[PDB]
């Protein structure tokens, strides 16, 4: 009622006052004396040319050589990036796929989309073929992300304002995260796989706690829907890519916004965000048909990856940082180095 | 310079490529239609002759169709509406008799404006179905159409009232040259609905064929 609304207003005012008090100097002032990385030159080393429709997601394997990509033709393809060979080709039940995942052990892959089901596939079977291990159902909205906690735990992000943690062996949600007021479109596991963040359509990102399930912090500052999120390699920060042509860097400990990656030239949103191995560079996949390598410490464009004829929808960096793979809406992938 | 195992892996990859090419060639011959409406507009009725998305598969005149019904996807429409960019046509179904109150004709107009004047569906021809024709005739025999259209000047006759409603619905689109809207008075318990859909699909197919040769 009125008193509860007043209490919420005063609590948010106190939160804003505390955030303003804890802010003493933006990192731009601290970083002015560091040497810029300069121009970044990237060349298309390989071009995976197997798909036949729009590509919506891809995930690097833990060995930094195998990767799995999902496209609208109802096919899951596992690539050998070194030789551009097709290790596997998994025909999905529903061609409307908006996410993909690769297990850290490499035994399983995950798929999901408009079918509201996050299926799991068994790569290493005695029969020699890939079968579906378990279909996870219970989301009332479309699937937008899915990450493998381990061989037995998977956490998914749905379009019904809910994030859930599953259990492949049993098939039911262990925990349910309900803090958002809009569609959730992204997910990013912490380096220690103890926390994670989600990017929702209400222009806010919440940091959860998978062990018990509750929103630790809520980060705001965006002006439109958040389309992609990614943890900093240190695990104490993350970056968000939204539809207002901006990328922003938040810090978990300080609970504030650090920098914004914006320019007057670009006006389209950001569809994918990923860091580098050392966290110095930020890669964002715009709708301008090319990616920008933002210098994450100085917010200056260090280079452009312009080799795609359509909107870049997925973008990832290997564990060792040796390559970055971008998949756009033309049925093409490109390995840059 | 490849070893024996590398050569065998390359052969397996080539076989996979052949299978993928065959699958894509077979899939490119299937007509994909997106079904839209206001929930109670009558999508279940039109889909009857042949927990997220629901796909309906049927064949007419040796042509393989595929109708997708979003149905209960109660989420952000603009967040997943671009997945359907590239369908042969859009079947927007609305009820002619649904104009009483709780009014919903304005909601259908808003939905049609949102779908037709969309950046993704710039060139995708939209097929408009106006069902519940008998119920609309019964309603118009007693209740005048002025309860829905304040700026209406006509008699309470089914023909001119239906023509006026169709004209108002058709005048919603902006791009009147790169996109065509097809109007059909369905609810006739015949095969006319699927024949009309087939004719529109054939026109779209001819338009697409007139693009690969540069004749466009």
């Amino acid at each position: 009622l009125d008193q509860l609304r007043q209490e919420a207003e005063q609590l948010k005012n106190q939160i804003r006052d505390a955030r303003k008090a804890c802010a003493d100097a933006t990192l731009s002032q601290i970083t002015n004396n560091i040497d810029p990385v300069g121009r970044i030159q990237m060349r298309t080393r390989r071009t995976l040319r197997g798909h036949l429709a729009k590509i919506y997601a891809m995930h690097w394997g833990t060995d930094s050589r195998l990767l799995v990509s999902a496209s609208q033709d109802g096919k899951l393809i596992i690539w050998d990036s070194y030789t551009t060979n097709k290790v596997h080709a998994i025909p999905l039940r529903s061609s409307w796929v908006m996410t993909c995942a690769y297990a850290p052990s490499g035994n399983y892959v995950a798929c999901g989309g408009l079918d509201n089901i996050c299926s799991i596939y068994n790569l290493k079977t005695r029969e020699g073929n890939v079968r579906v291990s378990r279909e996870l159902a219970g989301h009332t909205g479309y699937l937008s992300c899915c990450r493998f906690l381990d061989d037995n735990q998977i956490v998914t992000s749905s379009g019904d304002t809910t994030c859930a943690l599953w259990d492949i062996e049993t098939g039911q949600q262990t925990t349910t995260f309900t803090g958002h007021t809009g569609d959730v479109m992204s997910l990013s596991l912490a380096p220690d796989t103890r926390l994670f963040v989600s990017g929702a359509c209400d222009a806010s990102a919440k940091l959860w706690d998978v062990r018990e399930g509750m929103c630790r912090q809520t980060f705001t500052g965006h002006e439109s829907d958040i389309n992609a999120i990614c943890f900093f390699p240190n695990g104490n920060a993350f970056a968000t890519g939204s539809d207002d042509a901006t990328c922003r860097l938040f810090d978990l400990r300080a609970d504030q916004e650090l920098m914004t990656y914006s320019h007057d030239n670009i006006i389209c949103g950001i569809t994918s965000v990923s860091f580098s191995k050392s966290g110095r560079l930020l890669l964002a996949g715009y709708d301008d048909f090319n990616c920008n390598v933002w210098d994450a410490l100085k917010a200056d464009r260090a280079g452009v990856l312009a080799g795609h004829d359509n909107r870049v929808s997925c973008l990832g960096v290997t564990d060792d940082g040796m390559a970055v793979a971008t998949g756009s809406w033309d049925s093409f992938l490109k390995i840059w180095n | 310079t490849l070893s024996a195992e590398d050569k065998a892996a390359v052969e397996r990859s080539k076989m996979i490529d052949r299978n993928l090419r065959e699958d894509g060639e077979k899939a490119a011959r299937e007509v994909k239609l997106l079904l839209l409406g206001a929930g109670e507009s009558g999508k279940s009725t039109i889909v009857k002759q042949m927990t997220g998305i629901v796909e309906t598969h049927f064949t007419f005149k040796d042509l393989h169709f595929k109708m997708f019904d979003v149905g209960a996807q109660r989420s952000e429409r603009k967040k997943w509406i671009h997945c359907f960019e590239g369908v042969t046509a859009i079947i927007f179904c609305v009820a002619l008799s649904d104009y009483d109150l709780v009014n919903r004709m304005h909601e259908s107009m808003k939905l049609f404006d949102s779908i037709c004047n969309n950046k993704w569906f710039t060139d995708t021809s939209i097929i408009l179905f106006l069902n519940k024709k008998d119920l609309f005739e019964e309603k118009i025999k007693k209740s005048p159409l002025t309860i829905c259209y304040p700026e209406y000047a006509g008699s309470n006759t089914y023909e001119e009232a239906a023509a006026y409603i169709q004209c108002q619905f058709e005048d919603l689109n902006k791009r009147k040259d790169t996109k065509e809207i097809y109007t059909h008075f369905t609810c006739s318990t015949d095969t006319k609905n699927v024949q009309f859909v087939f004719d529109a699909v054939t026109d779209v197919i001819i338009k697409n064929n007139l693009k690969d040769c540069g004749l466009f």
Partner: single-chain antibody
Amino acid sequence: DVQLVESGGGLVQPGGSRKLSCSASGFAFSSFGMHWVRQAPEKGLEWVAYISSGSGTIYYADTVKGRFTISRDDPKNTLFLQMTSLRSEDTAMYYCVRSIYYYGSSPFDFWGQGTTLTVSSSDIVMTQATSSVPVTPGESVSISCRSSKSLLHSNGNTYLYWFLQRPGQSPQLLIYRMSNLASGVPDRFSGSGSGTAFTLTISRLEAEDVGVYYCMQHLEYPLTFGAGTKLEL
């Protein structure tokens, strides 16, 4: 489960044209390459033929080229091998080994039961040095295998496979590509080495480990096995 059963052996007069067959059931036969490996009674294994997935590549041993034919029937899930002009050297026990090739796969993983046939009266040389060695439970025995050409390819993986033939049953795969441990093999077995120097160690062995151990190369055809190191006691 996976099952490879062969039939067609028996007694053949010299100059016959008898055909062998092998029926497979329990796995996706259409995506596996099939080999034939014979074993003369008081001898070791010897590669015979090979046919890939889709029958696109077929290799033959130099001894049987021109007299043997290998073919598959994928819808029937059966593998054939037709022999013509049999000679007294062709007396052996024939196996139906299977192998699937991709990145990280384990070829020669399952071996058939084996059928016996009796007829009435630049290759890499793989030498296994010692032919017999007595062992006791609780010890650690290392088997040494050697090759002429270096088995380290430019990719970085050495193609050497370890097999174990228990008394009275088919051989089984232990280690593929000289370092990886096969599926179902306990941690006890371990292997390492380098080019032209390969060793397999059995730390803290026990019973049901007796039998001859064979080492095989896969760098280039024809595949060659070792003499076989026998373990007794």
